[PDB]
Design a protein around this motif. Structure first.
Motif, short mmCIF file in Angstrom:
data_model
loop_
_atom_site.label_atom_id
_atom_site.label_comp_id
_atom_site.label_asym_id
_atom_site.label_seq_id
_atom_site.Cartn_x
_atom_site.Cartn_y
_atom_site.Cartn_z
N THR A 16 0.82 -1.20 0.00
CA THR A 16 0.00 0.00 0.00
C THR A 16 0.86 1.25 0.00
OG1 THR A 16 -1.88 -1.06 1.07
CG2 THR A 16 -1.66 1.31 1.30
N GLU A 17 1.91 1.28 0.82
CA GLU A 17 2.78 2.44 0.87
C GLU A 17 3.46 2.67 -0.47
OE1 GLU A 17 5.54 2.27 4.09
OE2 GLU A 17 5.50 4.45 4.34
N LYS A 18 3.93 1.60 -1.11
CA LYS A 18 4.61 1.76 -2.39
C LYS A 18 3.65 2.12 -3.52
CE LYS A 18 8.85 -0.96 -2.22
NZ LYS A 18 9.53 -0.03 -3.17
N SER A 19 2.35 1.90 -3.33
CA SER A 19 1.38 2.07 -4.40
C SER A 19 0.65 3.39 -4.34
CB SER A 19 0.38 0.92 -4.38
OG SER A 19 -0.67 1.16 -5.31
N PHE A 20 1.29 4.45 -3.87
CA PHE A 20 0.67 5.76 -3.81
C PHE A 20 1.60 6.84 -4.35
CE2 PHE A 20 -2.92 4.05 -1.88
CZ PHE A 20 -3.87 5.03 -1.75
N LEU A 21 1.04 8.03 -4.53
CA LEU A 21 1.79 9.13 -5.13
C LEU A 21 2.82 9.66 -4.15
CD1 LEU A 21 -1.13 10.98 -6.95
CD2 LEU A 21 0.67 9.56 -7.96
N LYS A 22 3.87 10.28 -4.71
CA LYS A 22 4.99 10.74 -3.90
C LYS A 22 4.57 11.77 -2.87
CE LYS A 22 8.97 9.31 -6.34
NZ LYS A 22 8.92 8.25 -5.30
N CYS A 23 3.53 12.55 -3.16
CA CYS A 23 3.09 13.58 -2.22
C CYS A 23 2.67 12.96 -0.89
CB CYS A 23 1.93 14.38 -2.82
SG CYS A 23 2.21 14.91 -4.53
#
Lengths: 71, 73
Positions: A16-23
């Motif tokens: 989940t952490e890796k699968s989101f936008l950099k913001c």
């Protein structure tokens, strides 16, 4: 079984952490940047630290080495 | 020699987070019996209520509740 479950949840959290936008990821670092101490060079030792709280009813006397004398 | 011993020793914090904490509290927490004697002999109040935000019980929020009194501490 409990250990397997905890590892499964760990994999879920990492995905989940890796699968989101950099913001959001930059907005969701763990721990805080704290002035731990001084490097042997004397400069400030800034680190990303995670804070835990502990309670001991036998060895309170171990007062050696303390950041932030104010609680 | 500045005739200010009573006010200096019985001085305390002012901010809400450590409000009421007195050098006697610090002495008792540091476990210095000698400092306890020395402070109290020079007029240290032994009824100082350390009623700060830190010295109250709050879930999760860090703190230690001991009763706000030097004897209780």
């Amino acid at each position: 079984s409990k250990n397997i479950w905890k590892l499964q949840r760990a994999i879920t959290i990492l995905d989940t952490e890796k699968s989101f936008l950099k913001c959001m990821r930059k907005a969701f670092r763990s721990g805080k940047l704290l002035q731990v101490g001084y490097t042997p060079d004397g400069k400030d030792d800034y680190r990303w630290c995670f804070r835990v709280d502990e309670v001991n009813w036998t060895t309170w006397n171990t007062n050696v080495g303390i950041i932030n004398e104010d609680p | 020699q500045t005739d200010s011993l009573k006010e200096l020793v019985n001085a305390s914090y002012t901010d809400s987070y450590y409000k009421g904490q007195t050098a006697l509290h610090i002495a008792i927490e540091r476990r210095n019996m000698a400092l306890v004697t020395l402070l109290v002999e020079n007029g240290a109040d032994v009824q100082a209520a350390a009623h700060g935000d830190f010295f109250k019980k709050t879930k999760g929020r860090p703190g230690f509740y001991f009763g706000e009194l030097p004897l209780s501490l």
